[PDB]
Amino acid sequence: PIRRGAIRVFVNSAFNFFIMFTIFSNCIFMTISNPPAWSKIVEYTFTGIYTFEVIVKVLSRGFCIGHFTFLRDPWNWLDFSVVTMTYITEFRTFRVLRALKTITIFPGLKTIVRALIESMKQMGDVVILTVFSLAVFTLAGMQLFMGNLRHKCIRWPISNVTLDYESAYNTTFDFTAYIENEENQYFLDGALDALLCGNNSDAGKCPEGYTCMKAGRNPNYGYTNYDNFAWTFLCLFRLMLQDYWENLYQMTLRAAGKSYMVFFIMVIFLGSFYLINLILAVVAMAYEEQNQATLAEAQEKEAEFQRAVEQLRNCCGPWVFLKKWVHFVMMDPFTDLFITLCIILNTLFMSIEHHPMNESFQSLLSAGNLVFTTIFAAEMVLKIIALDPYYYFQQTWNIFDSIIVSLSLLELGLSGMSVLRSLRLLRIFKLAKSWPTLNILIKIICNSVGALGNLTIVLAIIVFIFALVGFQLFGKNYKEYVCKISDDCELPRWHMNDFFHSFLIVFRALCGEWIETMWDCMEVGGVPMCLAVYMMVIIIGNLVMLNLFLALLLSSFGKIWWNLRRTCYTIVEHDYFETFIIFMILLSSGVLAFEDIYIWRRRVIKVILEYADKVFTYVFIVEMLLKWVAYGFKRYFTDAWCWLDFVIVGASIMGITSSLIKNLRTIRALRPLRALSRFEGMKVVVRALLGAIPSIMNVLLVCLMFWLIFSIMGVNLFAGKFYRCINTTTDEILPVEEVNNRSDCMALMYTNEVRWVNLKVNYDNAGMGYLSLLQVSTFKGWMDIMYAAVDSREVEDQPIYEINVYMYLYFVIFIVFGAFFTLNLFIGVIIDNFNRQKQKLGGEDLFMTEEQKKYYNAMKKLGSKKAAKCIPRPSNVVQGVVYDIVTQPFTDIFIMALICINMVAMMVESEDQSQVKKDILSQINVIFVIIFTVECLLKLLALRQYFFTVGWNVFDFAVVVISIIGLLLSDIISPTLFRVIRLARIARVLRLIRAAKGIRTLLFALMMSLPALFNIGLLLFLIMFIFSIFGMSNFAYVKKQGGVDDIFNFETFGNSMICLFEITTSAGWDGLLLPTLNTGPPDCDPDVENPGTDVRGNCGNPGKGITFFCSYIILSFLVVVNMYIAIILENFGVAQEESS
């Protein structure tokens, strides 16, 4: 009947391709600002079309029971939810949730959201592992730093004669309202916060007349305070993911003290550690989603094969001749490698685009590329005639070449759109076929559309979905409460007030920079709704990225003379001569770190350093002597390590000579590199890495070439357009009410003081652009680059505030193709390159010398076996049922509760809470200590000798003895000691591990590979050590701007080691770069006198400045990626002996 008629309608494609269109139109509609002619009628139009779909989807399947069967599948289940909400709003994220229809219609996407949810079913064992693990750092991080970020730099009021701010006649009343005021306090120019200052001995002092008081606002907006558990926890969470974490680091060291680096080394290193423990859960999950794809599909390749098998049982003469004259040369290989000559030669010719380019270059590069256009056209037309046009077409590179020629001849007609010259350069991939490893990169890029092209849409949808969420919930709010954010009420550079800016702010927050948005977001939005989005956009967003970034990998699968020599070789063999040298190395280098600024302040240590290095040098002369007559000139030079001791001590020959140049203070500054030969543990790391390096060169060659095309393209778009006309006084760019040209900029300068400055790191050359392309990969300093680059107008024009905002795409079209697919190839080669070396070249395993292998194996027998039976029932009228007290499981779970209430006892400790709350906590703390002390004491009597056996009991008896001390120390009481006394209270919460099991297995594997995790850092500390002393002799006293403010300078070895670590994880490297980049005046007083030292000028060289950091980040990124290997082979090494 009528009901039946529906069923014909329901099963159609030709009605579903109307539902494919009403999404693809409502998807595009929800984007823009609201149009009023296409009013809520449209809102009502795409209301009923889903209703008219749901009606057919229910008037197909029966009456109420039939409708219910309808709702057995979850997809049909959501559909009801969206329509149900939309229909109600007759009388709003739910409008956005219409766009989830996109996933429902396609039967290919339903496999994915069925995978990316089942993979989240598995990972929930490791969340608890971490959220408990984060929270035990917070209670450590809260009690050290409670209210430390609140510190402000506050005035001390004038004790003058007249009563102009008379407080030496009355300072009693206004006090608590005085120090809140922003005007009274301090903050250097250009900081929307005050100046955090902590009054420990070493940490970050404040201008005279001012003092370090506690009370104030908080950092940023209020969302950085340690006080209170959550916000501190959020910061702690921030430090795990490395989102703008340098600033947090910076404001902790300034506030609390310089010596709290040791906290942010435990945080960052473990913070990293739990990230790799989430990732290895996905590896042990996303193998299982590709094990079943090889279990059932081959079985379905057997199910079809089994059943299938059963069923079975003048001119026209030269229209071919001159065609053959074409067809002869093309199949000859003197056409083939001729083209790859012209492609590479075309690439370079293009690249030389220096910025100014007078008519010599400006005619050369114009008339140059027209020659290559003749080459590429005659490449094309002589390949059309050769093999039938359609045949030529079928190969897609003949089709891709075909594309560029049409594009190539477009450019002549034009005589902004000159990016089209650079689409020649995609012909490089043509090279690939000959090439070995670029043929993996075009395998990877084509794989994101091919057999894994289903997944990219789920990324491309889910990234889009949050761009409509944040548009709706906040877009009207940034119009209305804008003022909280800016100074002038003009709409910051990352807003929700449109779609397309909204899209970037989810593309940014997917890259792992989401704090700088939330500070804003929470304030003009609200506290709960903003935080509900961002935590979501990571946890969904991060998971989607991991599957994409893992699954791309897994688819890319004389008798006296002689005796003298022996003695010489024999004396080197002795441990005494060898460890005497080792103490000569560590003491020479230890005097070496006394080098900088403060050396003019102490007089004797300038003298001690001067005379000791001769003796140290002389010891190494004796060693260079005795290595020779030991090994002989052949065997000495051919050893790799022994080359260095000839070089470094040889540079000490050429230094002691020149009394009878300043270059050779560099080499001496390199002499603690020689401990690599001497210590066994480092050498294994040096050896393994060397193996890594040859391949790395080939991976690097791809990327340098691949980026190069981007670098060439970038210069064309942006070169010399970064110049900005800048006022000196505020360093605001001039408005463009006046100064459209630089030629009219000059006239203003004549009358005034206002200057026209370049951008320091920009796309002026193909190599200077190369640098700015590195900044926008490692996510640091990239904000400055864009803001200029968005606003660019012409070669001479002055950039207005917000022209050309579609040029964020050039970074987004890069950072995907140049950071994601690039780096995913780089990891794709190494984790194969250690599959070859460990199996084929590996003796047993790696990163461990010979005794570390045995101590590794001593820790294997610890975990697997260790089990004693019932002990010391010891029945006695003095000790009867006490064996029931220790051993009954009525107890064991209940002691978990006694920590757990004590765990939330310490979570209410906030700042400024008043005594009464504090008094209760103090009383509560005493009670908790007594309970375990009585309990542990109870355990001791019952078990006499036997209990001491469990190491948990020993740990239990470790921790309670500590907690006894924590209260008697308080009856004694220095602020610094007292806080770290309360750090001992945290260790009671660590007792919950042997309850957990799930946590306790993976956290044991930390222990399992920690000595291999000791060398990786030991060579890392050596690497840090070299760049510190090389930093001090160059980059002290450079003009302190940006990242080198008052603490984080290379003035000493004190501040460098702090400064470097910040840069080991590749944060703030931009911050460091700008001072050293800058040269001359303006910006150099050079001839300037620092008061105290012996060197004039604050100028920092651009030569020494670039290769310092760029060869540190490459040395950053190998050894830490080396570190991630020696965890991953051990936690994937546990998963194979476990299964079998």
Binding site: P207, V607, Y611
Partner: protein, 172 residues
């Protein structure tokens, strides 16, 4: 950077000597305005005097014992100062005494002009015929103690190794 160093006080007669006084503002950053005044306790008696005063020109003080002789090698130009050191040309034995510098600065923050002052004291000690300074001599000698000491273990152990193995050489 900026580091304050306490000057030298052992000086050689007939000589141009430097008493350098550096006071570093607790926050080498905020714009200041300074003046240096030198004062002198003779070993005649304990009564100071002006001998030198400075504000972005040469401050010359009539004190005939020290007049027509001094010279500013302090921080030149910006009158931010920090480092005021003057030179005492042609030192004689009548110069032995105790100096006291006064930096008085009006740091004008940029919100509220404020002033403060600092005192360093230097006891000049004129000694004829300059020595090296008793830690340049001392580390001169301790170097050759270690160098000779080592040059022995080298010929100890070599002679000691040399006898030992040619003794095992007759067994081969």
């Amino acid at each position: 950077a900026c580091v304050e160093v306490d000057s030298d006080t052992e000086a050689v007669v007939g000589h141009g000597f430097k008493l350098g006084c550096i006071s570093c503002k607790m926050r080498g950053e905020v714009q200041a305005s300074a003046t240096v005044d030198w004062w002198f306790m003779a070993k005649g008696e304990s009564e100071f005097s002006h001998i030198y005063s400075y504000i972005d020109m040469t401050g010359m003080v009539n004190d005939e014992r020290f007049l027509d002789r001094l010279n500013w090698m302090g921080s030149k130009n910006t009158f931010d100062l920090q480092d005021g050191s003057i030179y005492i040309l042609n030192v004689t034995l009548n110069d032995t005494g105790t100096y006291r510098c006064y930096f008085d600065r009006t740091l004008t923050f940029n919100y509220y002009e404020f002033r403060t002052n600092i005192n360093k004291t230097i006891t000049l000690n004129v000694v004829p015929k300059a020595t090296r300074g008793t830690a340049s001599i001392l580390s001169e000698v301790m170097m050759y103690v270690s160098i000779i000491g080592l040059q022995l273990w080298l010929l100890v152990e070599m002679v000691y190794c040399y006898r030992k193995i040619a003794a095992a050489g007759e067994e081969a």
